[PDB]
Amino acid sequence: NYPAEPFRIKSVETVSMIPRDERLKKMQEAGYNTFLLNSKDIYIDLLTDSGTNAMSDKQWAGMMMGDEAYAGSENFYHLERTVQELFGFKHIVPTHQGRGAENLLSQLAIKPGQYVAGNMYFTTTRYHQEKNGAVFVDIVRDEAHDAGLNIAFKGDIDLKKLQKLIDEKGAENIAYICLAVTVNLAGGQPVSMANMRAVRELTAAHGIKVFYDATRCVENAYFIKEQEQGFENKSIAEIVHEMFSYADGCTMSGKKDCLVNIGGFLCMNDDEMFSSAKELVVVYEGMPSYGGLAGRDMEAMAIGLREAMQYEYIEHRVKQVRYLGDKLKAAGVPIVEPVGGHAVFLDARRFCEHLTQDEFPAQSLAASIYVETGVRSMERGIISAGRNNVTGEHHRPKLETVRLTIPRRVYTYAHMDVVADGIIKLYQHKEDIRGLKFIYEPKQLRFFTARFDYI
Amino acid sequence: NYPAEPFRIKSVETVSMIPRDERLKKMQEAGYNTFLLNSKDIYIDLLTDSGTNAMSDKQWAGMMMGDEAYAGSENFYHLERTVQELFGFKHIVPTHQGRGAENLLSQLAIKPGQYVAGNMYFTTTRYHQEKNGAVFVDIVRDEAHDAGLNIAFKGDIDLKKLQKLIDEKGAENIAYICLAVTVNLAGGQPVSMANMRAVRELTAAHGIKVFYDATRCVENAYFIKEQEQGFENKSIAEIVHEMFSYADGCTMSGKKDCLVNIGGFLCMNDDEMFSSAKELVVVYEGMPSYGGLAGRDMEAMAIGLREAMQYEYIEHRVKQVRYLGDKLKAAGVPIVEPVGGHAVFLDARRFCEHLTQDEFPAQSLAASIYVETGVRSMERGIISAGRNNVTGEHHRPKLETVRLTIPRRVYTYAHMDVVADGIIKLYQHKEDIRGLKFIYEPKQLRFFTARFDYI
Amino acid sequence: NYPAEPFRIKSVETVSMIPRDERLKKMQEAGYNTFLLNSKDIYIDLLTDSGTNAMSDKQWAGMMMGDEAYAGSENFYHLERTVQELFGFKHIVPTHQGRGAENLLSQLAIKPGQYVAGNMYFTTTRYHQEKNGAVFVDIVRDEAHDAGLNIAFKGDIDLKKLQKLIDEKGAENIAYICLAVTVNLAGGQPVSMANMRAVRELTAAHGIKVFYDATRCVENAYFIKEQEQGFENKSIAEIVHEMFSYADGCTMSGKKDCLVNIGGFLCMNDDEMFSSAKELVVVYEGMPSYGGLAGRDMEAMAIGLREAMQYEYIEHRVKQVRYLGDKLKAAGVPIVEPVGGHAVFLDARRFCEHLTQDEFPAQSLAASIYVETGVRSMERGIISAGRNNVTGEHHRPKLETVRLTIPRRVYTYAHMDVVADGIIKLYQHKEDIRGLKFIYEPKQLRFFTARFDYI
Amino acid sequence: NYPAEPFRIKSVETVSMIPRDERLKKMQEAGYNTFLLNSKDIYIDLLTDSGTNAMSDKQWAGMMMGDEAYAGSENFYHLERTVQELFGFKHIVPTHQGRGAENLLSQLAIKPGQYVAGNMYFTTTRYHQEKNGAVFVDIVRDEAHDAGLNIAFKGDIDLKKLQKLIDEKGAENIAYICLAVTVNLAGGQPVSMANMRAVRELTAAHGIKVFYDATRCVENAYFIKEQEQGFENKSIAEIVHEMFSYADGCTMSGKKDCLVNIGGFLCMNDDEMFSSAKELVVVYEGMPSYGGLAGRDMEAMAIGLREAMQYEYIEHRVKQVRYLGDKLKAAGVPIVEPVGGHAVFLDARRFCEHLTQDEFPAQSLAASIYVETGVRSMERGIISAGRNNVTGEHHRPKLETVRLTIPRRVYTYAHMDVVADGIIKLYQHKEDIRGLKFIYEPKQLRFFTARFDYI
Ligand SMILES: C=C(/N=C/c1c(COP(=O)(O)O)cnc(C)c1O)C(=O)O
Ligand SMILES: C=C(/N=C/c1c(COP(=O)(O)O)cnc(C)c1O)C(=O)O
Ligand SMILES: [K+]
């Protein structure tokens, strides 16, 4: 069952419906790298769900009431009250987006040489942990690393790995546990409430802090409501509030589940850390009462976080992604399983099994998808993994995928059909997909500006 | 086929359904007339495509650049030259919506006792004709009155009827021919270019003026491109411009095909009529330089009329209506055929064969649709047709219909499925729909605020 | 004493600061008629205070929450509740602006041959009265016709003239009393509460209806608060509510004192007339619940009417106009006295006493003002009076004036200084102002498109 | 002279004053630091010109056309090419505001132990220099530190000081010269083109890089046009482009002279530095294609930087500040002279000659201004100067000032008169202002959230 949109369209965004012949020329001008395409040339842009969301009429009304004062803006107090109400943390510091909050948390909470342990990781999060002297330890359950395994709550932390870390390194040498909801690297997999409570129980017995990476915590809450026994009578807001009751604080990218185009924040319960955070936020972001955001954006993020709590909104959000995954899977197209809250990942290793990884199957599949449909997707394979600059060899990741990342409230099921129909047609003659070779490769950030040609 | 939306969602508004018990209360508080229900108590609002459209990001950018000057506004010049370019008429007078332009035309072009002949009546149009002393004569082809007959270009004028009128009444006693594109009350049926050309040739030979009702001219142009031999490779804009080349002027409700929420205009080629129209507009609407519109709305209408010329936009507009009609017809639900440009008309005579037309089956069917579905639709039958101003008896249209009217760019195919599924279920117990009788009847245009009770 | 603006600027409107040499070319291209100037070529546009107001951030937030439903829009209920609260009338029908409401009132309230009596008149108001068969009778106090007489509440009705009318024509032959607040034709002069109560007392004794032309009723309320004994402790809202307690209904142009760019409405207390108005509004304007306005505009007008009740806003509005009049008067420039709520009128007969009225001194002064300052003003003299088309002679009005009409919240005191300094400099060599002659004169609406050259 | 605003008001926001008793309570709740007051409790907010500007109708139209794509946004391309055209640098990296660009520059261009030399310190700039291991050296002319000395181009670097630094330290130990235009903490003082050219010539001869702080470069260009011989007939844009031709790159807070509420960027000519900057921006800000900004804000900043080039806009901006300074100086109030581009600085040393600088007269004067006036102003003296990171003692600036900072396009001359009248009255009892002592001092950038009590 797939629900209708629980909203209607207030205003539309103009697009170029250029045809296949012209899309091929645009793809070649981009050197077959979807990251180099111009937005104006893309029909359906599934590069990312970050910051690409459609706002409501209520949020746009809030955008006309930005109090742009440098200190003490009414919009900050609205955001503060909303986050305290819905997440339940004592203190909040706005940041311009998620990695701004990560920067502050890692400087406040890590002594060099300490460990940070988490359920897999995200690139910016782990960078700020490592930059401040932490050693990262993955404590996710082993199943999360099996991309074909169709089981619930795949993002759960293995409590035995956490106990083992505590026993081998000592609780005083662990800076914090970093629990992400959902788990992006596993394909957007949720964490169960039972897991969050067990982690809080164990860490609290040792005086260890837990901070959440909360960027898709509402998608996570929907999975708990749908699949965890005992939560069928709880509202999304009740589930969200209980989730954060098991944490000492969080970092949040509003660009994901708060339904905005920019914005984030840092939450914590400890007064002393809050005071230290306010001393640091002015260094990198702005005042404790704007944190690198215009007043109107704090307002839109306060309104959007509250909208995200509507059951029908988040049900439809997750089930629209599920629709895309279900349609591909029914045609035999290989995807990461189960489908996550925000994206479908194509398995390009299996999709293009006639290509070796050195011929960049995911990069080439993403280029084919755009030519055939006008859909942009993100390479998440060997190109994004980068090259080892000491040895000169590619980093070879186990996952060679194309990410179909779904912005919130932007597309319809008919757009999902454009994406799926086009991929299914490609799959039916997948052996015709050609390998790629570099014609320009920069030393760093190579996925952003590299250019290719066909082998 | 059924194309996906050729645009993305930029902003949303929430929709919601109140329980059946509450809709029942609301419906009897509205005296079983859908016009009297409150917007907040509707779920999917298909009352009308008039003024309910979603604007684009470009139109909303135009809304921030309203030049609100009383005379000489940049927005007026933009609207004036956009209409001169796309429609080809010499002169434009803005009005706040279509019936303001009809008020002006009828006062300018009718001498009491004269005939106005058109391809089927419309409610406000016919009121202003008769109010100024004209007798209305219907010269549409007989087939347009047969709901079930699936033939192309049902809106066409019967040239034999036009010829007969000229012979029996004399050309000097005909004030003008009123040619509407599409024809709303026939079900949104298009008029062919061959018919517009034949009508021009016959009227010109007798010195008789032709004024178009331009309200859904872009939907009409799409049907010409899709189905009239020789037009398959003409652009929508080319077809629109050729259409109006066979007219002396037009009235336009921009609230339909100009993709806005308010706005209209009167066009003409004749200099003396334009001079007279400017004297009159001051009394009813405003100065000729804004015609009862804010500058920002002249701007949005100039932008939206040009957007409407995009083939993919109007193809999707029309085929989304066709999807709803196709799904209802596949389930056996009786509808007006072929499906028109803007709405699906349920054939209330067949839905409610247990009722005579004096029991108002269309009015009653609309009420029952809201009660069982939360979807609002409009009566288009004996209630809307009014009374004969000579005998005092009902006008008795063969077409007794309930209109599922689709606003432009607002809903998705999933919303269409919700509508179709609900109507198909009500079809299964159609015998439960009771007849209605008047408890309050306005003296004109009675359908707007009439109140009914069950017989 | 002149207060600072009780607001700050949220956003600005871009203007062309073209210099004098270029302004002279624009004036010549406009044939020396300020009505023909392009808005884009004007620095400070004082043509009118109608519909040219600046909205607040709160109103623009309301503009993002337009409920564009054809019937039952939430914005209509907001407007309805606001007008019932602030004006106290039982029923309200929205219209697209003031003359839409006048059209409806005059058709509902006049039997042919009846009299309508008022404190002077406005052009559209009297047209709709006369078009429906009324004979207009001026019952303003004699002093209002003395444009140099500096006395308070110059708009007051002479109760003896009203008694005389009742005695000579009979109360059953008077359709209604039309009491305007303020009185535009006298230069924007207020009416006292004592006068409103006396008129209500007298008319009620005879069963005669009173309807207000309420377009600048808030400016009027400020004069009562400032100058009528006993109202120093009353709020603007209290004064406004008491004013309308002496009326049976009103017509309102929101384009003036409701601080919007479009919109108006009709109010009445009588159920039967309300029911008749709802039958008529659909003919000319729209549904009783939108009346020719987009939902967003009903919202902005509801918000703006409530903002207009703020004492500091309306005090500053009236005193900014007063500042301009005081500065001109201190330099000896001849103006209509006292200065009204919305405009300063220059006496061009005295300003250009070396020119005869057939040389159009007001039209020429308005052209000079634009060339010297970039300020557009309105001719209100012999050109606007029109030509008698039977005899071919000008209508020769006693008042030959240039109107400096001040939009609400758009300009600063520094703009008022630009206007005043430029006029004062012109006055110091007023004998150099040249007379004008027609080079193009249309048969009607001649002030709108006539063109001139220097004698 | 004092020109009128070269724009009209398009939209407003209300302002209000709470009673003195309430401001007194608010001020001690803020611990006598103006940074801790709440926006709703301020009347006229002169805390800062940073991010408080009023945008234009064109910018707000741009805000409706935000292309929120993660890469390839039309808004990024517009900002990129606008900056390349107006500033002339080869490469641009957007950041969410200026201190994000300072974070990147300081990490890219400083090796620990090296010197950075600039024309007076700024708070966030100096923090990021020192945090990355640089020693700051002030090479502004001695006169810039003398509040009362009225000389032109007080921001100029002393070339003898620059030469001395090169001789004593060696050019290889200087990371770069930081040249700010205007110089904020000297009172908004401009730098001459002759000085920028001399600095470029001397640094280039030694291979030393020059990076500008571009934050108020348009105000600086205005002073050059107004006062530097030979530039009187150059356009603001020409002057701006020549200015940056003497630099290797710049940091920019668009929140000042780009007329926006959020936004900044880093420019450079060097290709390898640009490559490194793109790696770093990902960690702190976002992808190089949006740099921590929504698309709509890249758009507003591209539009606003071009608007700032309009001569009449920036002339009025600067002369409105000058008006406030002239009115205070005419009444004997001690100020920094000449008045700078963005603010009037009261000379707190002279206002409060009864206090030593260790009693924080500037911090105390700011509090008393809010208590007596409701006007918020900022401390710019010993509190902002921070502590010496080697000795732990106060930095002791000669300039102990209270800043009346003017947001662009927000206030009128009448608002300036309210401010001046209030300060002139407080001047009459200056002996009533008590000294302050710290009760809470942050470890860096302490002025933002420090809390004080009276001695
Ligand atoms: C309101 C509707 N139509 C308006 C209309 C009008 C009157 O336009 P305004 O509603 O803008 O006055 C004129 N001609 C045709 C063919 C129309 O359909 C409707 O069908 O719902
Ligand atoms: C916030 C202020 N200034 C910021 C600033 C900055 C830092 O910019 P952001 O506030 O955008 O980070 C850098 N350079 C100069 C000369 C500045 O004035 C202020 O003066 O109020
Ligand atoms: K974004």
Ligand SMILES: [K+]
């Ligand atoms: K701001």
Ligand SMILES: [K+]
């Ligand atoms: K207007």
Ligand SMILES: [K+]
């Ligand atoms: K509407």
